C-alpha cells in the first residue's frame, strides 16, 4: 500500500507545481500521465513556444527598448580569455572550465566578449555605451538542484555616463518587476547580489575595477549577469532547475517520458 | 600611388556591399571609417537588434505560426549520438567533431535531439508531429569563405501524415519566399538540396530512411536543415560568411575595428 521511494520519484517527475492517500501507484501515475499529455497538447494547439526561447525574446525586447544594443558573440572562445579574466588556479572557476582543443574552451561567462565590444564600440558610439547578450554558458558543477552544466546567461552593461549604483539597482528592479520575480538586492569596486530567498539570481558590479585595464577599458561601467534557467525556476516554481534546462527530458517543465 | 594588397584587404574589411581611383589609402580608409561608424550609430539609435538574433526570431515566428513546436535542446551532447547517427570513420563528419571530456561533444547537427523529441512526443501529441529547433552547431572546417566552425542551424521536421516531397518542397518554398531569398531545389529515402547559385543553403530528407530504426521512429517524416549565417550571407550580399557569424570582429556585417 505505501508508495516506494522509487514510485514517489516517478510521480514527482510527473507532478507539476500547480497540481492538487488511497489510490495505488498505477492509478496515481495514470492520472498524472493524462494531465501531462493534456498540458503538452494544449501547448501544441495554442502557443507552441519554448519557455527558454520565449524568456530570451522577452528579455531582449526589455533591453532593446531601454537602449541596449543586442550582441551575439562566440560561445567557443580562446582559452586565453579565461586567464585574462583573472581566473587563476587559485579560484573556484578554474576547475569548472570545459576545454576544447588546445586553445579553446566553452565560455563560462559573457564578460570577456562584452569587454571586447565595449572597447571597440567606444570608438563609434555615443556616450553612454549600452549593450547586452543572452546565450549559452558552461561550467562543470557538483550541484544539480540550483546548477546546470549547460546554462543560459543574460549580461547587460553600461559604460561612460550614468554608471552609478543607483542606476544599476533601478535597471535590476525594473527588470525583475517586469518579469514578475520577487528579489532582494544585497551588498555593502562595488559588487552586489540579487537573491530570491537563498537563491542567487544575479551578481552585479559597479566599476571601475582593476581588471578593466587588461581589456583596455578605463571608463566607469555598471553591469549584471542573470541565469535564465534560475529565472524560469523561480517564476514557474520548479523544484529542480532541470525543468528549466535545454533538455530531452522536460519541455516547458513537463516530463517528456510519458 | 597603387594600393598595396594589404591596403586593399583593409579597405575591403570596411566596404559594405552597398557602397559605391585617385585618392590615397588614408583618404579612402578615412571615408569608409566614418561611413561605418555612421552605420553603427544608426543601428544604435534606432533598431538595436543583432542580425543573427533577429533572423532567429523571424524564423521562429514563421514556424510557430505554421504549427511547429519550438524546441531548445542541449548543445553539449553525448558522443554516442554521433555514432548513433551513422557517422563512422568512413565519413567526412567523423573528423569534424569537437569532442569535450571523454563522453561528450559539441553537436554538429540538430538531428539526434530532434529524433528523440519526435519519439517522445509521439506518445502525447496528435498526428502529424511538427517541430523545429534553431541553435548553435559546431564542425571543424578547412574552408573559411562559405563555412564557419561555429554556426547556427534551423532544422524543422514533420512526422506522420502529410510527409510528402510535395509538402516538403512547399514549406521550403514558402519559407525562402517569406525571407526573400532566391533558391533552387535540386534532387532526383529521398534527399534534396536547396541551392543559391552554387551555395548550399539546405539539405532536406523525405523519410523513412533506415537510420530511423536506431532512434525508435517507424513513421514517415520530412525535414530540412538550413544554416542561418548562409541565409544572412545571401540576403545581405556579404562576400565572406564571417560577416554573418557570432563574432567580436563584425556586428551586422559592419567591422568593429574602427
Ligand atoms: N551552473 C549554473 N547553472 C544555472 N545558472 C548559473 C550557473 N552558474 C551561474 N549561474 C547564473 O549566473 C549568474 C551570474 O554568474 P556568477 O555570478 O558567476 O555565478 P556564481 O557566483 O557561480 N553563483 P553560484 O554558483 O550559485 O554561487 C548567477 O547568479 C546565476 O544566476
Ligand atoms: N560549417 C558551416 N558553416 C555555416 N553553415 C553550415 C556549415 N555546415 C553546414 N552548414 C549549413 O547546414 C546545412 C545543412 O547541413 P549539412 O547538410 O550537414 O551540411 P553539408 O552537407 O556539410 N554542406 P557543405 O559543407 O557546404 O557541403 C547546410 O546546407 C548549411 O546551410
Ligand atoms: Mg558557481
Ligand atoms: Mg555570483
Ligand atoms: Mg560540410
Ligand atoms: Mg548538405
CSV table of N, CA and C in Angstrom, one decimal, chain A residues 36-38 40-44 46-54 56-57 60-61 63-76 98-101 104 106-107 116-117 120-121 123-126 128-136 138 140 149-150 245-251 256-258, chain B residues 36-38 40-44 46-54 56-57 60-61 63-76 98-101 104 106-107 116-117 120-121 123-126 128-136 138 140 149-150 245-251 256-258:
chain,number,residue,atom,x,y,z
A,36,UNK,N,-0.4,15.4,-17.9
A,36,UNK,CA,0.8,15.9,-18.6
A,36,UNK,C,0.7,15.9,-20.1
A,37,UNK,N,0.0,14.8,-20.6
A,37,UNK,CA,-0.2,14.7,-22.1
A,37,UNK,C,-1.1,15.9,-22.5
A,38,UNK,N,-2.1,16.2,-21.7
A,38,UNK,CA,-3.1,17.3,-21.9
A,38,UNK,C,-2.4,18.6,-21.9
A,40,UNK,N,0.8,19.2,-22.7
A,40,UNK,CA,1.6,19.2,-24.0
A,40,UNK,C,0.7,19.5,-25.2
A,41,UNK,N,-0.5,18.8,-25.2
A,41,UNK,CA,-1.5,19.0,-26.2
A,41,UNK,C,-1.9,20.4,-26.4
A,42,UNK,N,-2.2,21.1,-25.2
A,42,UNK,CA,-2.6,22.5,-25.1
A,42,UNK,C,-1.5,23.4,-25.6
A,43,UNK,N,-0.2,23.2,-25.2
A,43,UNK,CA,0.9,23.9,-25.8
A,43,UNK,C,0.9,23.8,-27.3
A,44,UNK,N,0.8,22.6,-27.8
A,44,UNK,CA,0.9,22.3,-29.2
A,44,UNK,C,-0.2,23.0,-30.0
A,46,UNK,N,-2.0,25.7,-29.0
A,46,UNK,CA,-2.1,27.1,-29.0
A,46,UNK,C,-0.7,27.8,-29.2
A,47,UNK,N,0.0,27.9,-28.2
A,47,UNK,CA,1.2,28.8,-28.1
A,47,UNK,C,2.4,28.3,-28.9
A,48,UNK,N,2.8,27.1,-28.6
A,48,UNK,CA,3.9,26.4,-29.3
A,48,UNK,C,5.3,27.0,-29.0
A,49,UNK,N,5.4,27.8,-28.0
A,49,UNK,CA,6.7,28.4,-27.7
A,49,UNK,C,7.4,27.8,-26.6
A,50,UNK,N,8.7,27.6,-26.7
A,50,UNK,CA,9.5,27.0,-25.6
A,50,UNK,C,9.8,28.1,-24.6
A,51,UNK,N,9.7,27.7,-23.3
A,51,UNK,CA,10.0,28.7,-22.2
A,51,UNK,C,11.3,29.5,-22.3
A,52,UNK,N,12.3,28.8,-22.6
A,52,UNK,CA,13.6,29.3,-22.6
A,52,UNK,C,13.8,30.2,-23.8
A,53,UNK,N,13.3,29.9,-25.0
A,53,UNK,CA,13.3,30.7,-26.1
A,53,UNK,C,12.5,32.0,-25.9
A,54,UNK,N,11.3,31.8,-25.3
A,54,UNK,CA,10.3,32.9,-25.1
A,54,UNK,C,10.9,33.8,-24.0
A,56,UNK,N,14.0,34.4,-23.4
A,56,UNK,CA,15.1,35.1,-24.1
A,56,UNK,C,14.5,36.2,-25.0
A,57,UNK,N,13.4,36.0,-25.7
A,57,UNK,CA,12.8,37.0,-26.5
A,57,UNK,C,12.2,38.2,-25.7
A,60,UNK,N,15.2,40.3,-24.4
A,60,UNK,CA,15.7,41.0,-25.5
A,60,UNK,C,14.9,42.3,-25.7
A,61,UNK,N,13.6,42.1,-25.8
A,61,UNK,CA,12.7,43.3,-26.0
A,61,UNK,C,12.8,44.3,-24.9
A,63,UNK,N,15.5,44.9,-22.9
A,63,UNK,CA,16.7,45.7,-23.1
A,63,UNK,C,16.9,46.5,-24.4
A,64,UNK,N,16.5,45.9,-25.5
A,64,UNK,CA,16.4,46.7,-26.7
A,64,UNK,C,15.6,48.0,-26.5
A,65,UNK,N,14.4,47.9,-25.9
A,65,UNK,CA,13.5,49.0,-25.7
A,65,UNK,C,14.1,50.0,-24.8
A,66,UNK,N,15.1,49.6,-23.9
A,66,UNK,CA,15.7,50.5,-23.0
A,66,UNK,C,17.1,51.1,-23.5
A,67,UNK,N,17.4,50.9,-24.8
A,67,UNK,CA,18.5,51.5,-25.4
A,67,UNK,C,19.8,50.6,-25.4
A,68,UNK,N,19.7,49.3,-25.1
A,68,UNK,CA,20.8,48.4,-25.1
A,68,UNK,C,21.0,47.7,-26.4
A,69,UNK,N,22.2,47.7,-27.0
A,69,UNK,CA,22.5,47.0,-28.3
A,69,UNK,C,22.6,45.5,-28.0
A,70,UNK,N,21.9,44.7,-28.9
A,70,UNK,CA,21.9,43.2,-28.7
A,70,UNK,C,23.1,42.6,-29.3
A,71,UNK,N,23.8,41.9,-28.5
A,71,UNK,CA,25.1,41.3,-29.0
A,71,UNK,C,24.9,39.7,-29.2
A,72,UNK,N,25.5,39.2,-30.2
A,72,UNK,CA,25.7,37.7,-30.3
A,72,UNK,C,27.2,37.4,-30.5
A,73,UNK,N,27.9,36.9,-29.6
A,73,UNK,CA,29.3,36.6,-29.7
A,73,UNK,C,29.6,35.1,-29.5
A,74,UNK,N,30.8,34.7,-29.8
A,74,UNK,CA,31.1,33.3,-29.8
A,74,UNK,C,30.9,32.6,-28.5
A,75,UNK,N,30.5,31.3,-28.6
A,75,UNK,CA,30.3,30.5,-27.4
A,75,UNK,C,31.6,29.7,-27.1
A,76,UNK,N,32.3,29.3,-28.2
A,76,UNK,CA,33.6,28.7,-28.2
A,76,UNK,C,34.6,29.9,-28.2
A,98,UNK,N,35.2,23.8,-19.3
A,98,UNK,CA,35.2,22.8,-20.3
A,98,UNK,C,36.1,23.3,-21.4
A,99,UNK,N,37.3,22.6,-21.5
A,99,UNK,CA,38.3,22.9,-22.6
A,99,UNK,C,37.9,22.2,-23.9
A,100,UNK,N,38.2,22.8,-25.0
A,100,UNK,CA,38.0,22.2,-26.3
A,100,UNK,C,39.3,22.4,-27.0
A,101,UNK,N,39.9,21.4,-27.7
A,101,UNK,CA,41.2,21.5,-28.4
A,101,UNK,C,42.3,22.0,-27.4
A,104,UNK,N,41.1,26.4,-26.9
A,104,UNK,CA,39.7,26.9,-26.7
A,104,UNK,C,39.0,26.3,-25.6
A,106,UNK,N,34.6,26.3,-23.8
A,106,UNK,CA,33.2,26.8,-23.8
A,106,UNK,C,33.1,28.0,-22.8
A,107,UNK,N,32.6,29.1,-23.2
A,107,UNK,CA,32.6,30.3,-22.3
A,107,UNK,C,31.8,29.9,-21.0
A,116,UNK,N,35.3,43.1,-24.8
A,116,UNK,CA,35.8,43.5,-26.2
A,116,UNK,C,34.9,44.4,-27.0
A,117,UNK,N,33.6,44.2,-26.9
A,117,UNK,CA,32.6,45.0,-27.5
A,117,UNK,C,32.6,46.5,-27.0
A,120,UNK,N,35.7,48.2,-28.4
A,120,UNK,CA,35.6,48.5,-29.8
A,120,UNK,C,34.5,49.5,-30.1
A,121,UNK,N,33.3,49.3,-29.4
A,121,UNK,CA,32.2,50.2,-29.7
A,121,UNK,C,32.4,51.7,-29.2
A,123,UNK,N,34.8,53.5,-29.8
A,123,UNK,CA,35.3,54.2,-31.0
A,123,UNK,C,34.3,54.7,-32.0
A,124,UNK,N,33.0,54.3,-31.8
A,124,UNK,CA,31.9,54.5,-32.8
A,124,UNK,C,30.7,55.1,-32.2
A,125,UNK,N,30.4,54.8,-31.0
A,125,UNK,CA,29.0,55.0,-30.5
A,125,UNK,C,29.1,56.1,-29.4
A,126,UNK,N,28.0,56.9,-29.3
A,126,UNK,CA,28.0,58.0,-28.3
A,126,UNK,C,27.8,57.5,-26.9
A,128,UNK,N,26.3,57.3,-23.2
A,128,UNK,CA,26.9,56.0,-22.7
A,128,UNK,C,26.7,54.8,-23.7
A,129,UNK,N,27.6,53.8,-23.6
A,129,UNK,CA,27.5,52.6,-24.4
A,129,UNK,C,26.7,51.6,-23.6
A,130,UNK,N,25.6,51.1,-24.2
A,130,UNK,CA,24.7,50.2,-23.5
A,130,UNK,C,24.6,49.0,-24.3
A,131,UNK,N,25.0,47.8,-23.8
A,131,UNK,CA,24.9,46.6,-24.6
A,131,UNK,C,24.4,45.4,-23.7
A,132,UNK,N,24.0,44.3,-24.3
A,132,UNK,CA,23.7,43.1,-23.6
A,132,UNK,C,23.8,41.9,-24.5
A,133,UNK,N,24.0,40.7,-23.9
A,133,UNK,CA,23.9,39.5,-24.6
A,133,UNK,C,23.2,38.4,-23.8
A,134,UNK,N,22.5,37.6,-24.5
A,134,UNK,CA,21.9,36.4,-23.8
A,134,UNK,C,22.3,35.2,-24.6
A,135,UNK,N,22.9,34.2,-23.9
A,135,UNK,CA,23.3,33.0,-24.6
A,135,UNK,C,23.9,31.9,-23.7
A,136,UNK,N,24.2,30.7,-24.3
A,136,UNK,CA,24.7,29.6,-23.6
A,136,UNK,C,26.0,29.9,-22.9
A,138,UNK,N,28.8,27.6,-19.9
A,138,UNK,CA,29.1,26.2,-19.5
A,138,UNK,C,30.1,26.2,-18.3
A,140,UNK,N,31.4,23.1,-15.3
A,140,UNK,CA,31.3,21.8,-14.6
A,140,UNK,C,30.9,22.1,-13.2
A,149,UNK,N,25.2,22.4,-15.9
A,149,UNK,CA,26.5,22.5,-16.5
A,149,UNK,C,26.3,23.3,-17.8
A,150,UNK,N,25.2,23.1,-18.5
A,150,UNK,CA,24.8,23.9,-19.6
A,150,UNK,C,23.7,24.9,-19.3
A,245,UNK,N,15.9,23.6,-18.1
A,245,UNK,CA,17.1,23.5,-18.9
A,245,UNK,C,16.8,23.0,-20.4
A,246,UNK,N,17.7,23.3,-21.3
A,246,UNK,CA,17.8,22.7,-22.6
A,246,UNK,C,17.8,21.2,-22.2
A,247,UNK,N,17.0,20.4,-22.8
A,247,UNK,CA,16.8,19.0,-22.3
A,247,UNK,C,16.0,18.2,-23.3
A,248,UNK,N,16.3,16.9,-23.3
A,248,UNK,CA,15.4,15.9,-24.0
A,248,UNK,C,14.3,15.4,-23.0
A,249,UNK,N,14.4,15.7,-21.7
A,249,UNK,CA,13.6,15.1,-20.6
A,249,UNK,C,12.5,16.0,-20.1
A,250,UNK,N,12.5,17.3,-20.3
A,250,UNK,CA,11.4,18.2,-19.9
A,250,UNK,C,11.2,19.2,-21.1
A,251,UNK,N,10.0,19.5,-21.3
A,251,UNK,CA,9.6,20.5,-22.2
A,251,UNK,C,8.7,21.5,-21.5
A,256,UNK,N,8.8,14.7,-20.6
A,256,UNK,CA,8.6,14.1,-22.0
A,256,UNK,C,8.7,12.6,-22.0
A,257,UNK,N,8.9,11.9,-20.8
A,257,UNK,CA,8.8,10.5,-20.7
A,257,UNK,C,7.4,10.1,-20.2
A,258,UNK,N,6.5,10.1,-21.1
A,258,UNK,CA,5.1,9.9,-20.9
A,258,UNK,C,4.6,8.5,-21.3
B,36,UNK,N,31.1,53.6,-41.8
B,36,UNK,CA,30.9,52.5,-40.9
B,36,UNK,C,30.5,52.9,-39.5
B,37,UNK,N,31.1,54.0,-39.0
B,37,UNK,CA,30.7,54.5,-37.6
B,37,UNK,C,29.3,55.0,-37.7
B,38,UNK,N,28.9,55.6,-38.8
B,38,UNK,CA,27.6,56.2,-39.0
B,38,UNK,C,26.6,55.0,-39.1
B,40,UNK,N,26.8,52.1,-37.6
B,40,UNK,CA,26.7,51.6,-36.2
B,40,UNK,C,25.9,52.6,-35.4
B,41,UNK,N,26.1,53.9,-35.5
B,41,UNK,CA,25.3,54.9,-34.8
B,41,UNK,C,23.9,54.8,-35.1
B,42,UNK,N,23.5,54.6,-36.4
B,42,UNK,CA,22.1,54.4,-36.8
B,42,UNK,C,21.5,53.2,-36.2
B,43,UNK,N,22.2,52.1,-36.3
B,43,UNK,CA,21.7,50.9,-35.6
B,43,UNK,C,21.4,51.2,-34.1
B,44,UNK,N,22.4,51.8,-33.4
B,44,UNK,CA,22.3,52.0,-32.0
B,44,UNK,C,21.1,53.0,-31.7
B,46,UNK,N,18.3,53.5,-33.5
B,46,UNK,CA,17.0,53.0,-33.9
B,46,UNK,C,16.7,51.6,-33.4
B,47,UNK,N,17.1,50.6,-34.3
B,47,UNK,CA,16.7,49.3,-34.1
B,47,UNK,C,17.3,48.5,-33.0
B,48,UNK,N,18.7,48.5,-32.9
B,48,UNK,CA,19.4,47.8,-31.8
B,48,UNK,C,19.4,46.3,-31.9
B,49,UNK,N,18.9,45.7,-33.0
B,49,UNK,CA,18.9,44.2,-33.0
B,49,UNK,C,20.0,43.6,-33.8
B,50,UNK,N,20.5,42.5,-33.3
B,50,UNK,CA,21.6,41.8,-34.0
B,50,UNK,C,21.0,41.0,-35.1
B,51,UNK,N,21.6,40.9,-36.3
B,51,UNK,CA,21.0,40.2,-37.4
B,51,UNK,C,20.7,38.7,-37.2
B,52,UNK,N,21.6,38.1,-36.4
B,52,UNK,CA,21.5,36.7,-36.2
B,52,UNK,C,20.4,36.4,-35.2
B,53,UNK,N,20.3,37.3,-34.1
B,53,UNK,CA,19.2,37.1,-33.2
B,53,UNK,C,17.9,37.4,-33.9
B,54,UNK,N,17.8,38.5,-34.7
B,54,UNK,CA,16.6,38.9,-35.4
B,54,UNK,C,16.2,37.8,-36.4
B,56,UNK,N,16.8,34.6,-36.2
B,56,UNK,CA,16.3,33.5,-35.4
B,56,UNK,C,14.8,33.8,-35.0
B,57,UNK,N,14.5,35.0,-34.5
B,57,UNK,CA,13.2,35.4,-34.1
B,57,UNK,C,12.2,35.4,-35.3
B,60,UNK,N,11.5,31.6,-36.1
B,60,UNK,CA,10.7,31.1,-35.1
B,60,UNK,C,9.2,31.4,-35.3
B,61,UNK,N,9.0,32.7,-35.5
B,61,UNK,CA,7.6,33.1,-35.8
B,61,UNK,C,7.0,32.4,-37.0
B,63,UNK,N,7.7,29.4,-38.3
B,63,UNK,CA,7.4,28.0,-37.9
B,63,UNK,C,6.3,27.9,-36.8
B,64,UNK,N,6.4,28.6,-35.8
B,64,UNK,CA,5.4,28.6,-34.7
B,64,UNK,C,4.0,28.9,-35.4
B,65,UNK,N,3.9,29.9,-36.3
B,65,UNK,CA,2.6,30.2,-36.9
B,65,UNK,C,2.2,29.1,-37.8
B,66,UNK,N,3.1,28.3,-38.3
B,66,UNK,CA,2.7,27.2,-39.2
B,66,UNK,C,2.5,25.9,-38.4
B,67,UNK,N,2.4,25.9,-37.1
B,67,UNK,CA,2.0,24.7,-36.3
B,67,UNK,C,3.2,23.9,-35.8
B,68,UNK,N,4.4,24.4,-35.9
B,68,UNK,CA,5.6,23.7,-35.4
B,68,UNK,C,6.0,24.1,-34.0
B,69,UNK,N,6.2,23.1,-33.1
B,69,UNK,CA,6.5,23.3,-31.7
B,69,UNK,C,8.0,23.7,-31.7
B,70,UNK,N,8.4,24.7,-30.9
B,70,UNK,CA,9.7,25.3,-30.8
B,70,UNK,C,10.5,24.4,-29.8
B,71,UNK,N,11.6,23.9,-30.2
B,71,UNK,CA,12.4,23.1,-29.3
B,71,UNK,C,13.7,23.8,-28.9
B,72,UNK,N,14.2,23.7,-27.7
B,72,UNK,CA,15.5,24.0,-27.3
B,72,UNK,C,16.2,22.9,-26.6
B,73,UNK,N,17.2,22.2,-27.2
B,73,UNK,CA,17.8,21.0,-26.7
B,73,UNK,C,19.3,21.3,-26.5
B,74,UNK,N,20.0,20.3,-25.8
B,74,UNK,CA,21.3,20.6,-25.4
B,74,UNK,C,22.2,20.8,-26.6
B,75,UNK,N,23.3,21.6,-26.5
B,75,UNK,CA,24.3,21.9,-27.5
B,75,UNK,C,25.5,20.9,-27.2
B,76,UNK,N,25.7,20.7,-25.9
B,76,UNK,CA,26.7,19.7,-25.5
B,76,UNK,C,26.0,18.4,-25.4
B,98,UNK,N,34.0,18.3,-32.6
B,98,UNK,CA,34.7,18.9,-31.5
B,98,UNK,C,34.3,18.1,-30.2
B,99,UNK,N,35.2,17.3,-29.7
B,99,UNK,CA,35.0,16.5,-28.5
B,99,UNK,C,35.2,17.3,-27.2
B,100,UNK,N,34.4,17.0,-26.2
B,100,UNK,CA,34.5,17.6,-24.9
B,100,UNK,C,34.5,16.5,-23.9
B,101,UNK,N,35.5,16.5,-23.0
B,101,UNK,CA,35.6,15.4,-22.0
B,101,UNK,C,35.8,14.0,-22.7
B,104,UNK,N,31.5,13.4,-24.3
B,104,UNK,CA,30.7,14.5,-24.9
B,104,UNK,C,31.3,15.1,-26.1
B,106,UNK,N,30.4,18.8,-28.9
B,106,UNK,CA,29.5,19.9,-29.4
B,106,UNK,C,28.7,19.4,-30.6
B,107,UNK,N,27.4,19.5,-30.6
B,107,UNK,CA,26.5,19.0,-31.7
B,107,UNK,C,27.0,19.5,-33.0
B,116,UNK,N,15.0,12.3,-30.9
B,116,UNK,CA,14.5,12.0,-29.6
B,116,UNK,C,13.1,12.6,-29.2
B,117,UNK,N,13.0,13.9,-29.6
B,117,UNK,CA,11.7,14.6,-29.4
B,117,UNK,C,10.5,14.0,-30.2
B,120,UNK,N,9.5,10.7,-28.3
B,120,UNK,CA,8.8,11.1,-27.1
B,120,UNK,C,7.5,11.7,-27.3
B,121,UNK,N,7.5,12.7,-28.2
B,121,UNK,CA,6.2,13.5,-28.5
B,121,UNK,C,5.1,12.6,-29.1
B,123,UNK,N,4.0,10.0,-28.2
B,123,UNK,CA,3.3,9.4,-27.1
B,123,UNK,C,2.2,10.4,-26.5
B,124,UNK,N,2.3,11.7,-27.0
B,124,UNK,CA,1.4,12.7,-26.4
B,124,UNK,C,0.7,13.6,-27.3
B,125,UNK,N,1.2,13.8,-28.5
B,125,UNK,CA,0.7,14.8,-29.4
B,125,UNK,C,0.0,14.1,-30.6
B,126,UNK,N,-1.1,14.8,-31.1
B,126,UNK,CA,-1.8,14.3,-32.3
B,126,UNK,C,-1.0,14.3,-33.6
B,128,UNK,N,-0.3,15.1,-37.5
B,128,UNK,CA,1.2,14.9,-37.5
B,128,UNK,C,1.9,15.7,-36.4
B,129,UNK,N,3.2,15.2,-36.1
B,129,UNK,CA,4.0,15.9,-35.1
B,129,UNK,C,4.9,16.9,-35.9
B,130,UNK,N,4.9,18.1,-35.5
B,130,UNK,CA,5.6,19.2,-36.3
B,130,UNK,C,6.5,19.9,-35.3
B,131,UNK,N,7.8,19.8,-35.4
B,131,UNK,CA,8.7,20.5,-34.5
B,131,UNK,C,9.8,21.2,-35.2
B,132,UNK,N,10.5,22.1,-34.6
B,132,UNK,CA,11.8,22.7,-35.1
B,132,UNK,C,12.7,23.2,-34.0
B,133,UNK,N,14.0,23.4,-34.4
B,133,UNK,CA,14.9,24.0,-33.4
B,133,UNK,C,15.8,24.9,-34.2
B,134,UNK,N,16.2,26.0,-33.6
B,134,UNK,CA,17.3,26.8,-34.1
B,134,UNK,C,18.3,27.0,-33.1
B,135,UNK,N,19.6,26.7,-33.4
B,135,UNK,CA,20.6,26.9,-32.4
B,135,UNK,C,22.0,26.6,-32.9
B,136,UNK,N,23.0,26.8,-32.0
B,136,UNK,CA,24.4,26.7,-32.4
B,136,UNK,C,24.8,25.2,-32.7
B,138,UNK,N,28.5,22.9,-34.4
B,138,UNK,CA,29.9,23.1,-34.5
B,138,UNK,C,30.5,22.0,-35.3
B,140,UNK,N,34.6,21.3,-37.2
B,140,UNK,CA,35.9,21.7,-37.7
B,140,UNK,C,35.9,21.8,-39.2
B,149,UNK,N,33.2,27.4,-38.2
B,149,UNK,CA,33.3,26.3,-37.3
B,149,UNK,C,32.2,26.4,-36.2
B,150,UNK,N,31.8,27.6,-35.9
B,150,UNK,CA,30.7,27.8,-35.0
B,150,UNK,C,29.5,28.4,-35.9
B,245,UNK,N,28.6,35.8,-38.8
B,245,UNK,CA,28.9,35.0,-37.7
B,245,UNK,C,28.8,35.7,-36.3
B,246,UNK,N,28.6,34.9,-35.2
B,246,UNK,CA,28.9,35.3,-33.9
B,246,UNK,C,30.3,35.7,-34.0
B,247,UNK,N,30.7,36.9,-33.4
B,247,UNK,CA,32.0,37.4,-33.8
B,247,UNK,C,32.2,38.6,-32.9
B,248,UNK,N,33.5,38.9,-32.6
B,248,UNK,CA,34.0,40.1,-32.0
B,248,UNK,C,34.4,41.1,-33.0
B,249,UNK,N,34.4,40.7,-34.3
B,249,UNK,CA,35.0,41.4,-35.5
B,249,UNK,C,34.0,42.1,-36.4
B,250,UNK,N,32.8,41.6,-36.4
B,250,UNK,CA,31.7,42.2,-37.2
B,250,UNK,C,30.5,42.3,-36.4
B,251,UNK,N,29.7,43.3,-36.6
B,251,UNK,CA,28.4,43.5,-36.0
B,251,UNK,C,27.4,43.8,-37.1
B,256,UNK,N,33.9,46.0,-36.6
B,256,UNK,CA,34.0,46.6,-35.3
B,256,UNK,C,35.5,47.2,-35.0
B,257,UNK,N,36.4,47.0,-35.9
B,257,UNK,CA,37.8,47.5,-35.8
B,257,UNK,C,37.8,48.9,-36.6
B,258,UNK,N,37.3,49.9,-35.9
B,258,UNK,CA,37.1,51.2,-36.5
B,258,UNK,C,38.1,52.2,-36.0
